[model samples]
Target: TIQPGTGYNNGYFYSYWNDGHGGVTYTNGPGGQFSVNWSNSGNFVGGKGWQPGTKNKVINFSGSYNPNGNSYLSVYGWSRNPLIEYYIVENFGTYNPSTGATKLGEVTSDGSVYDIYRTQRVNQPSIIGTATFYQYWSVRRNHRSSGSVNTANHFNAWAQQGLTLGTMDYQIVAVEGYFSSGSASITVS
Candidate 1:
């Protein structure tokens, strides 16, 4: 079982976060595998992967995803130097994350089309404390539950669009729930 913080299990970093209005439970499996469940009203995000994540790699993953409300399944992580949070969204429930952001363009990768968006967060909590930063997003035009994400493609695309990234930080294939409840089983390699 995993607690509501960051830790290592089966050679992967696992993390859980919640606003305390509900409950969440996580079970870590071998390698980059894990299962998680959340209930009631608060927001939550959890998953497993590397701590000092690779800058660009072909991330192969598979998952069984079920979200009862607004949620996201994505290749999520952060970067430093310039401090940026990023996401390569694979699937979602009840919400389109690109609804209000600046559409920077699109890219084709791993057999799908992804719309790129850039947004800013002001004085929000992050892996390196509360600071303002930009978020780079590559939301898939179509949702899938299993596949490969050639991260380099997105990174290069972001760069071409002037959405440069900094030094790589913790990266995970994460599930996020916002005022929602859901569960998932995921494996990454």
Candidate 2:
């Protein structure tokens, strides 16, 4: 059995995966970390979150992934209200949004590189609290690197280009997986 919504660890960590189509399990690790495992049918699993505006501050952490399934890791952040999402996504299986995604150039922060993109999801009802929203993704372009992406810089860049980013609702550094069988696991601090 898996406890849902920050179970066992109190509030230091959080995660979500396909509940009906699949399942996610977890164990609390030393030093406020989470060891998450999942078997997904057709969905994504994610973890690590903080209130809005944490992205502008200097943050540091790392993790590892061992998924015998379709999966990837990402350090991501989000804002609600026609929201925007940023990510440093690691490709493992096959999840690509570049088909019709608008490339917004690249931004570098603390020596990390991110290629930005923009998309709009209109009137979607399946997602919790989701609506006609705009998404901005500052996806890292470099591979095999651990570092920070200047989130504030990307926001400012968007602002300068005529996009006004609203207040962030929450931010997270997470790993996501997908599969019909097998399991995916990730650990981070």
Candidate 3:
């Protein structure tokens, strides 16, 4: 059992959850800052941070994690019609154990080598149009601890591949903990 809620905070919409076996608290900080504190045993909590806008954007974000294991801190941007997704994932434990997605080799973007993946989810519902959509993920080979990551560079590389990116729905930054047993804290500014 998880409690789900949606709220607006500091120009960002926060959609969050708390798994039955664990608990968490999200504290809204000053400006563009957010803090999540939790203690769990084989369960977890976290959510997505979003800003509404459309277009190719240079997104900058950074965060710090403490006593970490079994969590996902990811950034994603999507558009309708095409339902294209640009993603950057940072994981602490088994968060992204496997994606079951096709590995489309590696690409060098923004002076970094990212492994590209193409996944299509079908028969879903959408705000843009049809439910069938394509999701493109450009992921770094290494997991980051605390650093600023840019997403627009990956968008540029995808555009070059002849994929059609529609209008932007929103850009997201999220954290998820799964099957975890430990105390953790995350702060993003």
- The all-Cα superposition gives candidate 3 an RMSD in Å to the true structure of 4.2
In model 1, which regions exceed 4 Å deviation? Answer: none
Model 1 Cα lDDT, one tens digit per residue, 105-188: 999998889999999999998988899999999999889989999899999999999998889988889988887778899998
Q: Write candidate 3's Cα lDDT for 56-123 as tens digits.
A: 44444566665355766666566866666556665455545337777666666544577767778687
| TM agreement with the true structure for every prediction | 0.96, 0.74, 0.71
Candidate 3 error regions (>4 Å) = 1-3, 17-22, 38-50, 66-70, 95-98, 109-111, 122-132, 181-189
Give the lDDT of residue 66 in candidate 2.
60
- Candidate of highest lDDT: 1
User: How many angstroms is residue 146 displaced in model 3 relative to the true structure, after the best TM-score fit?
Assistant: 2.7
Residue clash pairs of candidate 1: none
Cα RMSD for candidates in order: 1.1, 3.4, 4.2
Q: What is the lDDT of residue 93 in candidate 3?
A: 59
Which stretch of 10 consecutive residues in model 3 shows the poorest summed lDDT? 180-189
Give stretches of model 2 more than 4 Å off.
6-13, 53-55, 67-70, 90-93, 97-99, 125-128, 180-189
What is the clash tally of candidate 1?
0
Q: Write the per-residue lDDT of candidate 2 for residues 3-81, one digit (tens) a residue.
A: 5453324444454545455566655555435566666555565565555445465544555556555666565666655
